[PDB]
Short mmCIF file of all heavy atoms in Angstrom, two decimals:
data_model
loop_
_atom_site.label_atom_id
_atom_site.label_comp_id
_atom_site.label_asym_id
_atom_site.label_seq_id
_atom_site.Cartn_x
_atom_site.Cartn_y
_atom_site.Cartn_z
N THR H 1 -9.65 0.44 22.97
CA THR H 1 -9.87 -0.91 22.44
C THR H 1 -11.46 -0.93 22.41
O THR H 1 -12.12 -0.21 23.17
CB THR H 1 -9.46 -1.81 23.54
OG1 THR H 1 -8.10 -2.19 23.54
CG2 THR H 1 -10.48 -1.88 24.73
N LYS H 2 -12.02 -1.84 21.67
CA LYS H 2 -13.38 -2.11 21.24
C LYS H 2 -13.60 -3.61 21.45
O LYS H 2 -12.93 -4.37 20.72
CB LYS H 2 -13.18 -2.19 19.64
CG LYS H 2 -14.55 -1.95 18.95
CD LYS H 2 -14.44 -0.98 17.85
CE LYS H 2 -15.80 -0.82 17.10
NZ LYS H 2 -16.27 0.54 17.25
N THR H 3 -14.50 -4.20 22.18
CA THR H 3 -15.15 -5.49 21.91
C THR H 3 -15.87 -5.70 20.66
O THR H 3 -16.87 -4.95 20.54
CB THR H 3 -16.08 -5.96 23.08
OG1 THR H 3 -15.07 -5.71 24.09
CG2 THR H 3 -16.84 -7.25 23.20
N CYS H 4 -15.59 -6.38 20.28
CA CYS H 4 -15.98 -6.52 18.96
C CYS H 4 -17.29 -7.31 19.00
O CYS H 4 -17.75 -7.74 20.06
CB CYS H 4 -14.80 -7.04 18.12
SG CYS H 4 -13.56 -6.19 17.72
N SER H 5 -17.87 -7.49 17.82
CA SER H 5 -19.13 -8.22 17.72
C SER H 5 -18.85 -9.72 17.74
O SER H 5 -17.80 -10.19 17.25
CB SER H 5 -19.85 -7.85 16.44
OG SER H 5 -19.29 -8.51 15.31
N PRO H 6 -19.79 -10.47 18.31
CA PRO H 6 -19.63 -11.93 18.39
C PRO H 6 -19.45 -12.51 17.00
O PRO H 6 -20.23 -12.21 16.08
CB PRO H 6 -20.89 -12.38 19.07
CG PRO H 6 -21.93 -11.32 18.77
CD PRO H 6 -21.13 -10.03 18.67
N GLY H 7 -18.59 -13.35 16.75
CA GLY H 7 -18.31 -13.97 15.44
C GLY H 7 -17.01 -13.41 14.87
O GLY H 7 -16.12 -14.16 14.46
N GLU H 8 -16.92 -12.08 14.86
CA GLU H 8 -15.73 -11.42 14.33
C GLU H 8 -14.49 -11.91 15.10
O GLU H 8 -14.35 -11.66 16.31
CB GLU H 8 -15.82 -9.87 14.48
CG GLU H 8 -15.61 -9.04 13.20
CD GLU H 8 -14.62 -9.68 12.14
OE1 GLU H 8 -13.88 -10.56 12.44
OE2 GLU H 8 -14.80 -9.11 11.07
N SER H 9 -13.62 -12.60 14.38
CA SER H 9 -12.39 -13.11 14.99
C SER H 9 -11.18 -12.29 14.52
O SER H 9 -10.03 -12.61 14.86
CB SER H 9 -12.19 -14.56 14.62
OG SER H 9 -11.55 -14.71 13.35
N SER H 10 -11.30 -11.28 13.07
CA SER H 10 -10.38 -10.18 12.94
C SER H 10 -10.30 -8.79 13.56
O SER H 10 -11.17 -8.22 14.10
CB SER H 10 -10.60 -10.08 11.46
OG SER H 10 -9.90 -10.82 10.58
N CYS H 11 -8.96 -8.15 13.34
CA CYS H 11 -8.83 -6.81 13.56
C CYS H 11 -8.04 -5.96 12.55
O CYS H 11 -7.33 -6.79 12.02
CB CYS H 11 -8.11 -6.64 14.82
SG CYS H 11 -8.43 -7.25 16.39
N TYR H 12 -8.06 -4.74 12.30
CA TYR H 12 -7.58 -4.13 11.15
C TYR H 12 -6.70 -2.94 11.49
O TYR H 12 -6.99 -2.23 12.34
CB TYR H 12 -8.42 -3.79 9.87
CG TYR H 12 -9.46 -2.75 10.19
CD1 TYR H 12 -9.05 -1.37 9.90
CD2 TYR H 12 -10.57 -3.15 10.75
CE1 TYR H 12 -9.98 -0.29 10.19
CE2 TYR H 12 -11.27 -1.91 10.87
CZ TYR H 12 -11.23 -0.54 10.73
OH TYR H 12 -11.79 0.71 10.77
N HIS H 13 -5.62 -2.75 10.68
CA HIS H 13 -4.75 -1.47 10.88
C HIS H 13 -4.80 -0.89 9.42
O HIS H 13 -4.37 -1.56 8.52
CB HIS H 13 -3.36 -1.96 11.35
CG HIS H 13 -2.32 -0.83 11.35
ND1 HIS H 13 -1.54 -0.44 12.33
CD2 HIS H 13 -1.82 0.05 10.50
CE1 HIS H 13 -0.66 0.52 12.25
NE2 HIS H 13 -0.85 0.79 11.12
N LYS H 14 -5.32 0.34 9.13
CA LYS H 14 -5.18 0.95 7.69
C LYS H 14 -4.27 2.22 7.74
O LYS H 14 -4.49 2.88 8.68
CB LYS H 14 -6.49 1.56 6.99
CG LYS H 14 -7.65 0.88 7.59
CD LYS H 14 -8.66 1.88 8.21
CE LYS H 14 -9.86 1.83 7.16
NZ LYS H 14 -10.97 2.40 8.20
N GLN H 15 -3.62 2.33 6.67
CA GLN H 15 -2.73 3.62 6.86
C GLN H 15 -2.91 4.16 5.39
O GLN H 15 -2.87 3.35 4.41
CB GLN H 15 -1.42 3.03 6.91
CG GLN H 15 -0.23 3.66 7.60
CD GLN H 15 1.06 3.59 6.72
OE1 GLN H 15 1.61 2.46 6.91
NE2 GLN H 15 0.99 4.59 5.97
N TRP H 16 -3.23 5.46 5.44
CA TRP H 16 -3.09 6.17 4.16
C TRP H 16 -2.54 7.62 4.55
O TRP H 16 -1.91 7.80 5.62
CB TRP H 16 -4.32 6.52 3.30
CG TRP H 16 -5.31 7.47 4.01
CD1 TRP H 16 -5.75 8.72 3.87
CD2 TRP H 16 -6.24 6.92 5.01
NE1 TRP H 16 -6.80 9.18 4.80
CE2 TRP H 16 -7.00 8.04 5.39
CE3 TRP H 16 -6.36 5.74 5.77
CZ2 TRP H 16 -7.97 8.08 6.38
CZ3 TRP H 16 -7.37 5.72 6.67
CH2 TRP H 16 -8.14 6.86 7.08
N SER H 17 -2.72 8.63 3.80
CA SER H 17 -2.17 10.02 4.05
C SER H 17 -2.67 10.87 2.89
O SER H 17 -3.15 10.29 1.89
CB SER H 17 -0.65 10.01 3.95
OG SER H 17 -0.24 10.12 2.59
N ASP H 18 -2.57 12.06 2.99
CA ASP H 18 -3.48 13.00 2.27
C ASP H 18 -3.10 14.38 2.82
O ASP H 18 -2.26 14.24 3.68
CB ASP H 18 -4.93 12.71 2.82
CG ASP H 18 -5.70 13.03 3.88
OD1 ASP H 18 -5.73 13.53 4.99
OD2 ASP H 18 -6.64 12.47 3.27
N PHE H 19 -3.89 15.40 2.35
CA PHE H 19 -3.52 16.81 2.59
C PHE H 19 -3.13 16.92 4.01
O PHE H 19 -2.18 17.70 4.33
CB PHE H 19 -3.89 17.79 1.58
CG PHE H 19 -5.29 17.82 2.06
CD1 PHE H 19 -5.85 18.62 3.06
CD2 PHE H 19 -5.90 16.81 1.36
CE1 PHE H 19 -7.33 18.42 3.42
CE2 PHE H 19 -7.29 16.60 1.75
CZ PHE H 19 -7.80 17.41 2.68
N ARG H 20 -3.41 16.34 5.08
CA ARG H 20 -3.57 16.78 6.56
C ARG H 20 -2.45 15.92 7.02
O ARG H 20 -1.79 16.59 7.92
CB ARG H 20 -4.86 16.29 7.19
CG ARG H 20 -6.20 16.75 6.45
CD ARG H 20 -7.15 15.57 6.27
NE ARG H 20 -7.69 15.72 7.66
CZ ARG H 20 -8.47 14.83 8.43
NH1 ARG H 20 -9.43 14.01 7.75
NH2 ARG H 20 -8.35 14.75 9.75
N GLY H 21 -2.14 14.74 6.59
CA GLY H 21 -0.86 13.97 7.00
C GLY H 21 -1.06 12.49 6.65
O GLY H 21 -1.64 12.16 5.57
N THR H 22 -0.56 11.74 7.69
CA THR H 22 -0.53 10.30 7.27
C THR H 22 -1.58 9.87 8.28
O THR H 22 -1.52 10.50 9.35
CB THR H 22 0.73 9.61 7.91
OG1 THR H 22 1.67 10.07 6.91
CG2 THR H 22 0.85 8.09 7.80
N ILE H 23 -2.36 8.81 8.14
CA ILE H 23 -3.41 8.33 9.21
C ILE H 23 -3.37 6.79 9.36
O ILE H 23 -3.04 6.24 8.29
CB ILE H 23 -4.86 8.44 8.58
CG1 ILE H 23 -5.24 9.81 7.98
CG2 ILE H 23 -5.79 8.00 9.79
CD1 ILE H 23 -5.38 10.91 9.14
N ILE H 24 -3.74 6.42 10.58
CA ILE H 24 -3.78 5.01 10.67
C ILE H 24 -5.15 4.75 11.28
O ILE H 24 -5.48 5.44 12.33
CB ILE H 24 -2.86 4.02 11.09
CG1 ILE H 24 -3.16 2.62 11.59
CG2 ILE H 24 -2.45 4.83 12.34
CD1 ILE H 24 -3.46 1.21 11.80
N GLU H 25 -6.03 3.88 10.76
CA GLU H 25 -7.28 3.75 11.66
C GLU H 25 -7.05 2.29 12.08
O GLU H 25 -6.57 1.44 11.26
CB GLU H 25 -8.56 3.59 10.77
CG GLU H 25 -9.97 3.95 10.96
CD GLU H 25 -10.92 3.92 9.64
OE1 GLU H 25 -10.97 4.73 8.75
OE2 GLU H 25 -11.69 2.91 9.75
N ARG H 26 -7.58 2.19 13.19
CA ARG H 26 -7.67 0.85 13.83
C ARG H 26 -9.15 0.51 14.19
O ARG H 26 -9.98 1.06 14.67
CB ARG H 26 -7.02 0.54 15.15
CG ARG H 26 -5.49 0.30 15.36
CD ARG H 26 -4.76 1.62 15.15
NE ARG H 26 -3.57 1.20 16.04
CZ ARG H 26 -2.76 2.32 15.86
NH1 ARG H 26 -3.32 3.46 15.99
NH2 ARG H 26 -1.39 2.28 15.69
N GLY H 27 -9.70 -0.69 13.94
CA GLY H 27 -11.05 -1.33 14.23
C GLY H 27 -11.17 -2.86 14.15
O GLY H 27 -10.20 -3.76 14.04
N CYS H 28 -12.16 -3.61 14.20
CA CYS H 28 -12.67 -5.01 14.16
C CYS H 28 -12.96 -5.17 12.60
O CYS H 28 -13.58 -4.21 12.06
CB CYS H 28 -13.98 -4.89 14.90
SG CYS H 28 -13.84 -4.93 16.78
N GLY H 29 -12.55 -6.38 12.23
CA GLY H 29 -12.14 -6.59 10.82
C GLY H 29 -11.29 -7.22 9.83
O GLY H 29 -10.25 -7.97 9.30
N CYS H 30 -12.06 -7.04 8.67
CA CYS H 30 -11.25 -6.57 7.58
C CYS H 30 -11.93 -6.15 6.38
O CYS H 30 -11.84 -7.04 5.39
CB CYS H 30 -10.50 -7.80 7.60
SG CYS H 30 -9.10 -7.95 6.29
N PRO H 31 -12.29 -4.87 6.35
CA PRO H 31 -12.43 -3.99 5.14
C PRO H 31 -12.03 -4.54 3.90
O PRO H 31 -11.33 -5.64 3.77
CB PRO H 31 -12.69 -2.73 5.90
CG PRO H 31 -11.28 -2.73 6.50
CD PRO H 31 -10.99 -4.24 6.89
N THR H 32 -12.60 -4.32 2.67
CA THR H 32 -12.10 -4.56 1.24
C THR H 32 -11.25 -3.40 0.95
O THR H 32 -12.02 -2.44 1.20
CB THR H 32 -13.26 -3.96 0.31
OG1 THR H 32 -14.39 -4.29 1.04
CG2 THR H 32 -13.30 -5.11 -0.67
N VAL H 33 -10.05 -3.10 0.72
CA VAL H 33 -9.50 -2.24 1.86
C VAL H 33 -8.94 -0.93 1.23
O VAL H 33 -9.31 -0.01 2.02
CB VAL H 33 -8.29 -3.16 1.86
CG1 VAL H 33 -7.16 -2.43 1.12
CG2 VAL H 33 -8.28 -4.36 2.72
N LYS H 34 -8.50 -0.85 -0.06
CA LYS H 34 -9.19 0.02 -1.04
C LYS H 34 -8.46 0.95 -2.03
O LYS H 34 -7.50 1.12 -1.32
CB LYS H 34 -10.63 0.53 -1.08
CG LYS H 34 -10.69 1.82 -1.79
CD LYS H 34 -9.77 3.03 -1.74
CE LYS H 34 -10.35 4.34 -1.89
NZ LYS H 34 -11.75 4.35 -2.35
N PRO H 35 -8.23 1.32 -3.26
CA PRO H 35 -7.26 2.33 -3.85
C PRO H 35 -6.44 3.13 -3.06
O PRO H 35 -6.86 4.26 -2.57
CB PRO H 35 -8.29 2.72 -4.94
CG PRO H 35 -8.49 1.36 -5.57
CD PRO H 35 -7.85 0.47 -4.50
N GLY H 36 -5.13 2.85 -2.70
CA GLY H 36 -4.53 4.10 -1.95
C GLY H 36 -4.23 3.72 -0.54
O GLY H 36 -3.94 4.38 0.52
N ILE H 37 -4.54 2.40 -0.54
CA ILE H 37 -5.10 1.69 0.51
C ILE H 37 -4.84 1.78 1.95
O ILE H 37 -5.75 2.26 2.65
CB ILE H 37 -4.95 0.20 0.80
CG1 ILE H 37 -3.48 -0.16 0.84
CG2 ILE H 37 -5.46 -0.86 -0.06
CD1 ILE H 37 -2.69 -1.00 1.85
#
């Protein structure tokens, strides 16, 4: 887990996949989040 920066009241789960497999990143947020997304 990460403390996030003061002000930031979101958190983010992204999942995509590609040659190596499927991935999920987790961080403080929300990304514009993106083609493929």
Side-chain angles (χ1 to χ4, degrees):
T1 271
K2 201 133 176 117
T3 312
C4 287
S5 78
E8 234 328 344
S9 85
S10 274
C11 306
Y12 66 94
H13 170 127
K14 335 123 106 159
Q15 205 225 275
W16 62 112
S17 83
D18 81 348
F19 78 88
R20 301 133 83 195
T22 278
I23 307 292
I24 157 84
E25 209 166 283
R26 284 69 155 177
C28 278
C30 180
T32 324
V33 102
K34 152 318 214 349
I37 53 134

